Amino acid sequence: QMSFTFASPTQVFFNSANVRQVDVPTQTGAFGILAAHVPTLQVLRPGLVVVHAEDGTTSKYFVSSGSVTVNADSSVQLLAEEAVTLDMLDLGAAKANLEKAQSELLGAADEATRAEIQIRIEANEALVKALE
Amino acid sequence: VAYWRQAGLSYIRYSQICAKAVRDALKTEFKANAMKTSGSTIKIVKV
Amino acid sequence: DIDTAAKFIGAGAATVGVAGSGAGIGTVFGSLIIGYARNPSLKQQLFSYAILGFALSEAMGLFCLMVAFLILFA
Amino acid sequence: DIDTAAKFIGAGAATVGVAGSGAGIGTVFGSLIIGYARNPSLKQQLFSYAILGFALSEAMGLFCLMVAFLILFA
Amino acid sequence: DIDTAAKFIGAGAATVGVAGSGAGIGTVFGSLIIGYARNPSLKQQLFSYAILGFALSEAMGLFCLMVAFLILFA
Amino acid sequence: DIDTAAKFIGAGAATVGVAGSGAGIGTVFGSLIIGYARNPSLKQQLFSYAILGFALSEAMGLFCLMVAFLILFA
Amino acid sequence: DIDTAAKFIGAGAATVGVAGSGAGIGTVFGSLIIGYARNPSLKQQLFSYAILGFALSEAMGLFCLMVAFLILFA
Amino acid sequence: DIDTAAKFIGAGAATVGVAGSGAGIGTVFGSLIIGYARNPSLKQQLFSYAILGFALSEAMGLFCLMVAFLILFA
Amino acid sequence: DIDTAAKFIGAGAATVGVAGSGAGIGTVFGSLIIGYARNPSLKQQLFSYAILGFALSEAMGLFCLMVAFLILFAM
Amino acid sequence: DIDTAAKFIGAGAATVGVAGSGAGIGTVFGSLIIGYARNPSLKQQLFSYAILGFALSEAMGLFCLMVAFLILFA
Amino acid sequence: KIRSILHRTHSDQFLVTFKEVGRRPPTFGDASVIALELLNSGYEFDEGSIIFNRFRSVISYKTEEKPIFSLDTISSAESMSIYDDIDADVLRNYQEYSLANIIYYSLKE
């Protein structure tokens, strides 16, 4: 079966747990991991991981970044740099930050700043799309 | 390549910026309980 | 007579178009297999797309067979 | 008549091209699924592509039938 | 006779419709291989969709065969 | 006119060739969807290549309809 | 007899169906390569699908060859 | 009359062959779309082999047009 | 004649059947290309699996090629 | 004479299958594009397999055209 | 302290060093800073080791060393053949993150 390990640097949510399916975002493309998924390495994108226990229960944790590894022996390791449960967020702050970022992206101070603002944009965009 | 790398950013920077965003977008209560254990005090010395 | 000859030729050669509808159904359902073997969580939205693609694809074969019927009956 | 017979012959081979359309639509309505599996954060924006991928996909289909029209009555 | 030749040629030029159906079967069972190979646990579920696509796509080629036999023997 | 009938059957055979362009455009505009799903940031390049290939494949369908007219008329 | 000729006409215009077969088999044994390269571990169960699909599509294509032999010899 | 009728019909048969080149051209310009989405930093390098595939798929269509002209005029 | 000449078109319309075999073998070898690109370590086995799909598709085409050459010679 | 007419028709029908070779070549080169984008380092070996498969599908298509040439001339 | 103890022999080999460690508890931000200042420094290291003091128990610690690699090693490591969707983009972004992870783990230990 699947041995899950979801752990922010600050806190650990699952330690070698046994869940049925886990849906995770990713740079390439958001996808799901099941009890025999082929081994892969990926680095997460601002999104929301969704876990389902052996039963039909669910849980959604919004993750900023990180890396998800699926190993030969069916062991998923989802190390997220900042993993927060949805009940910790507020809409207006994220929405205003997103709109501010869109406003400032017009100001092409430099390509590095353009990229930084773009990252902030789609970060807050995933936040709102999760909360809207 | 990705839209955030043409400039030349490392994925560390990508995660750092995304994490700062997700921190900024928390409850007013959890801001006090997350602003700590989030900053950085290390500083570099010229070689 | 030769009029019936052309009738039968047309009926026979019109139905061949249904091959495209068959291939469309095949490719759409293969895409469903792949896109549900990637992100199974959805499904409750993918199968909708697969069924819509079925309707749309089998429409072409239906058209070809109705053309065959009309050319062999009027 | 031989003329009507040739009209029918051309009609039979004027509706075969619809198979092309049959494949076309399918491919798009295959790819969409794949795409929508790998990136549910572009669903809506994908629809536009899909409808475009439908119109120009069925386009030739209809035009093939157009020839049939002509080859039946022109 | 011209009419009997008509029926036989109609059957012959209709039977080709199976090509698209065969291509669709091949596409479906290639998609199944890839999908299962990525995510083996989903097997018995992917298999249902893929075999369903098989049968529910070869329905078109069998419609072509049925119309061919209709023309030949009727 | 036997020769006008031969022109008609030639046009009926020729008009099918656009099925190739239909299939090609289906492939192009499904690849567009999935590639845009993978790498949205480059939408403008995706349209550029997609439309370039679209016309560049419509080459064949326009050729086939043109030759249908030419056998019919010229 | 004009039937003795239209028989061969139909046989030739019917054996073309094997094209779609060949294409389906090709797709299946390409998809097998991708699937096995991606996930070499579960080698065997890939065959339980590859051979199944190949033989299945090959048989449904051979239906057209069977029909062609039937008409050419009956 | 029948000789030029054969001219017309055989040319119309030849004109169909460009459909496969249409399918292949669409395939190559969908593959370029994908391969550019996945590794954008290899534009021109990918484009070189893409235009090579253009040339080697246009070969078939232009040869089919060549044979069509030859058999309609020689 | 007609029945001694219609065999020519019979054979031609049978020989058209090889197009799909050509397409199938093309996609087989494209799949070989992609498979090798993914896992270049598996160079040996992939070629064998190719040869297999190669042979099966080309034989399926040979069926129609022989049907045509039957039309011309064995009718 | 009708023999020459049937001979033209046979050649024109046989010279359409190179559509298959065109589609196969297009698919092979699309796969080349994708594989190269996957692994830019390995292009020679990818190109080696690509030229082998290319040339062999070329052999099949040109074999079809050789049969067309023969039937026109014999 | 590490810089000083090794500024007599191996004085020249220093590439960069950091201060204000341990004054306050370390955080993933500190590890990210170290990883950034390592990657940006134009040194294309082909291998590495990280030495730290694993905390066995309140009485004992062990000077442990963990290896670390580079994307050029990962690509050419045949053992990676069984991991899919592995180009030279996700693989080395993952390598950057792995470097930051190991730095943070060593900091905490």
Query: Residue A85: what are its φ and ψ, rounded to 5°?
Result: -70, 145
Structure-block tokens of residue A4: 């899950």
Against chain E, the chains showing at least 3 CB pairs within 8 Å are A, C, D, G, I
* Cα dihedral across residues F29, H58, E22, G55: positive or negative: negative
Query: Which has the closest alpha carbon to H43: F36, F48, K86, J50?
Result: F48
Q: Give the C-alpha separation, G45 to G23, whole Å.
A: 23
Q: Give the C-alpha separation, K85 to C27, whole Å.
A: 23
Kind and range of the H or E run holding A33 = strand A31-33
Contact G26, I23 (CB under 8 A): yes
Q: What is the DSSP letter of A55?
A: S
Q: Give the C-alpha separation, J54 to J22, whole Å.
A: 10
Kind and range of the H or E run holding E61 = helix E43-73
Q: Give the C-alpha separation, G74 to A66, whole Å.
A: 70
Q: Characterize the bridge pairing of strands A75-80 and A3-7.
A: parallel
Q: Give the C-alpha separation, H31 to D44, whole Å.
A: 24
Give the nearest chain A residue to E43 (CA atoms): A36
H-type helices in H1-74, by residue range? 2-15, 18-38, 43-73
> Within 10 Å of residue I55's Cβ, how many Cβ atoms?
13
Q: In B, which residues are within 8 Å of A119 by CB distance?
A: 4, 14, 17-18, 21
> Within 10 Å of residue H44's Cβ, how many Cβ atoms?
7
Kind and range of the H or E run holding A42 = strand A40-44
Chain I nearest C-alpha distance from G14 (Å):
7
Structure-block tokens of residue D14: 């004027």
Q: Is D1 on the interface with C (CB under 8 A)?
A: yes
Query: Residue A9: what are its φ and ψ, rounded to 5°?
Result: -55, -40
Structure-block tokens of residue K86: 């592995």
Q: Residues G40-45: contacts with CB within 8 Å, 24+ apart?
A: G40/I39, G40/I42, G40/K81, G40/K82, G41/A38, G41/A72, G41/K82, G42/E37, G42/E40, G45/E36, G45/E40, G45/E43
SS3 content of chain I, % helix, strand, coil (to 5): 85, 0, 15
Length of chain F equals 74
Chains C and K: 3 or more CB pairs within 8 Å of each other: no
> Within 10 Å of residue G63's Cβ, how many Cβ atoms?
19
Q: In H, which residues are within 8 Å of F55 by CB distance?
A: none
- Amino acid in the structure at residue E47: F
A84/B26 touch (CB, cutoff 8 Å), yes or no: yes
Helix (H, G, I), strand (E, B) or coil at A6: strand
Contact D37, C34 (CB under 8 A): yes
Interfacial H residues in 55-74 facing J (CB < 8 Å): 56-57, 59-61, 63-64, 67-68, 71
Contact K92, K24 (CB under 8 A): no
Q: Give the C-alpha separation, F55 to B46, whole Å.
A: 59
With a CB cutoff of 8 Å and minimum separation 6, the contacts of D51 are none
Q: In K, which residues are within 8 Å of A81 by CB distance?
A: 28
Query: Which has the closest alpha carbon to A7: A76, A70, A98, A59?
Result: A76
Helix D2-12 with C2-14: angle, nearest 10 deg: 10
Q: Give the C-alpha separation, H31 to J71, whole Å.
A: 37
Structure-block tokens of residue B8: 């030349």
Length of chain C equals 74
Contact B5, A112 (CB under 8 A): no
- A72, H26, H62 from H19: Cα distances, Å: 45, 11, 11
Torsion over CA of A124, A128, A130 and B4, rounded to 10 degrees?
Answer: -30
Q: What value does the CA radius of gyration of chain D take, rounded to a whole number of Å?
A: 17
Q: What is the DSSP letter of A54?
A: S
Contact H9, F9 (CB under 8 A): yes
Q: Give the C-alpha separation, A3 to C33, whole Å.
A: 26
> Within 10 Å of residue F23's Cβ, how many Cβ atoms?
33
First to last CA, chain F: 16
* Cα dihedral across residues E19, E20, E21, E27: positive or negative: positive
First to last CA, chain A: 35
**DSSP notation for G38-74:** H-GGGHHHHHHHHHHHHHHHHHHHHHHHHHHHHHHH-
Q: Give the total number of structural domains in chain I.
A: 1
D·E CB contacts under 8 A: 4
Contact C53, D52 (CB under 8 A): no
Contact C18, E64 (CB under 8 A): yes
| Method for this entry | cryo-EM
Q: What is the DSSP letter of A57?
A: -
Q: Is I31 on the interface with J (CB under 8 A)?
A: yes
Q: Give the C-alpha separation, D8 to F12, whole Å.
A: 9
Kind and range of the H or E run holding A12 = strand A12-17
Q: Is I23 on the interface with G (CB under 8 A)?
A: yes
Strand order in the sheet with A12-17: A12-17, A3-7, A75-80, A66-70, A40-44
Query: Which has the closest alpha carbon to B37: A7, K104, K55, K36?
Result: K104
With a CB cutoff of 8 Å and minimum separation 6, the contacts of D19 are C16, C17, C18, C19, C20, C21, C23, C60, C64, E20, F19
Structure-block tokens of residue F5: 């009938």
Torsion over CA of B13, B14, B17 and B21, rounded to 10 degrees?
Answer: -160
The CA-based angle G34-G35-G36, given to 5 degrees, is 95
Q: In J, which residues are within 8 Å of H14 by CB distance?
A: 12, 15-16
> Within 10 Å of residue C4's Cβ, how many Cβ atoms?
15
Give the nearest chain A residue to F37 (CA atoms): A29
Q: Give the C-alpha separation, G24 to G8, whole Å.
A: 26
* Cα dihedral across residues E25, E28, E30, E33: positive or negative: negative
Strand extents, DSSP E, D1-74? none
Query: Which has the closest alpha carbon to K28: J19, F62, B38, E10?
Result: B38
Q: Is D20 on the interface with E (CB under 8 A)?
A: no
- Amino acid in the structure at residue B11: Y
**DSSP notation for F13-42:** HHGGGHHHHHHHHHHHHHHHHHHHHH-GGG
- Amino acid in the structure at residue G63: F
Structure-block tokens of residue D33: 């699924």
Against chain G, the chains showing at least 3 CB pairs within 8 Å are A, E, I, J, K
Helix (H, G, I), strand (E, B) or coil at A4: strand
**Residue B45 CB burial class (10 angstroms; 0-12, 13-18, ≥19):** exposed
Contact K92, K44 (CB under 8 A): no
Could you tell me if residue K44 is left (phi over 0), alpha (psi between -120 and 50 degrees) or otherwise beta?
A: beta
Kind and range of the H or E run holding A19 = strand A19-24
Against chain C, the chains showing at least 3 CB pairs within 8 Å are A, D, E
Q: Could you list the residue range(s) of the whole structural domain that residue H25 is in?
A: 1-74
Structure-block tokens of residue H53: 């595939």
K82/G38 touch (CB, cutoff 8 Å), yes or no: no
> Within 10 Å of residue F73's Cβ, how many Cβ atoms?
8
- Amino acid in the structure at residue H60: M
Q: Give the C-alpha separation, H9 to H1, whole Å.
A: 12
Q: In A, which residues are within 8 Å of B40 by CB distance?
A: none
Length of chain K equals 109
Q: What value does the CA radius of gyration of chain E take, rounded to a whole number of Å?
A: 17
Query: Residue A33: what are its φ and ψ, rounded to 5°?
Result: -120, 125
G46/E27 touch (CB, cutoff 8 Å), yes or no: no
Contact A65, A42 (CB under 8 A): no
> Within 10 Å of residue B7's Cβ, how many Cβ atoms?
15
**DSSP notation for A59-120:** EEEEE-SEEEEE-TTSEEEEEESSEEEGGGB-HHHHHHHHHHHHHHHTS-S-HHHHHHHHHH
Torsion over CA of J39, J40, J42 and J45, rounded to 10 degrees?
Answer: 100
With a CB cutoff of 8 Å and minimum separation 6, the contacts of J45 are I36, I40, I43
Structure-block tokens of residue C26: 């095949």
Helix (H, G, I), strand (E, B) or coil at C39: coil
Torsion over CA of C28, C31, C33 and C36, rounded to 10 degrees?
Answer: -120
Helix (H, G, I), strand (E, B) or coil at E5: helix
Q: Give the C-alpha separation, K7 to K57, whole Å.
A: 31
Contact E15, G67 (CB under 8 A): yes
Burial K18-29 (b: 16+ CB within 10 A, else e): beebeeeebbbb
Query: Which has the closest alpha carbon to F8: D14, J15, G9?
Result: D14
Q: Give the C-alpha separation, E47 to E41, whole Å.
A: 11
Helix (H, G, I), strand (E, B) or coil at A125: helix
Q: Give the C-alpha separation, K35 to A18, whole Å.
A: 33
Query: Which has the closest alpha carbon to H40: F38, F3, C31, I18?
Result: F38
CA A124 to chain centre: 12
**DSSP notation for chain K:** -HHHHTSSSSSTT---EEE--SSS---HHHHHHHHHHHHHSS---S-EEEEEEEEEETTEEEEEEEEE--HHHHHH-GGGGG-BS--TTHHHHHHHHHHHHHHHHHHH-
Q: Is I7 on the interface with G (CB under 8 A)?
A: yes
Q: In H, which residues are within 8 Å of F17 by CB distance?
A: 15-19, 22
Helix (H, G, I), strand (E, B) or coil at A40: strand
Query: Which has the closest alpha carbon to A63: A35, A36, A92, A83?
Result: A83
Burial K36-61 (b: 16+ CB within 10 A, else e): bbbbeeeeeeeeeeeebeeeeeeeee
Chain I nearest C-alpha distance from K81 (Å):
6
Contact A108, A117 (CB under 8 A): no
Q: Give the C-alpha separation, F27 to J23, whole Å.
A: 12
The CA-based angle E63-E67-E72, given to 5 degrees, is 145
The CA-based angle A38-I37-D46, given to 5 degrees, is 70
Chain C nearest C-alpha distance from D67 (Å):
13
Where is chain E discontinuous (C–N over 2.5 Å), named by the preceding residue?
A: none
Check which CATH number belongs to the domain holding C62 and give it: 1.20.20.10
Structure-block tokens of residue E72: 């030949």
> Within 10 Å of residue E24's Cβ, how many Cβ atoms?
38
- Amino acid in the structure at residue G24: G
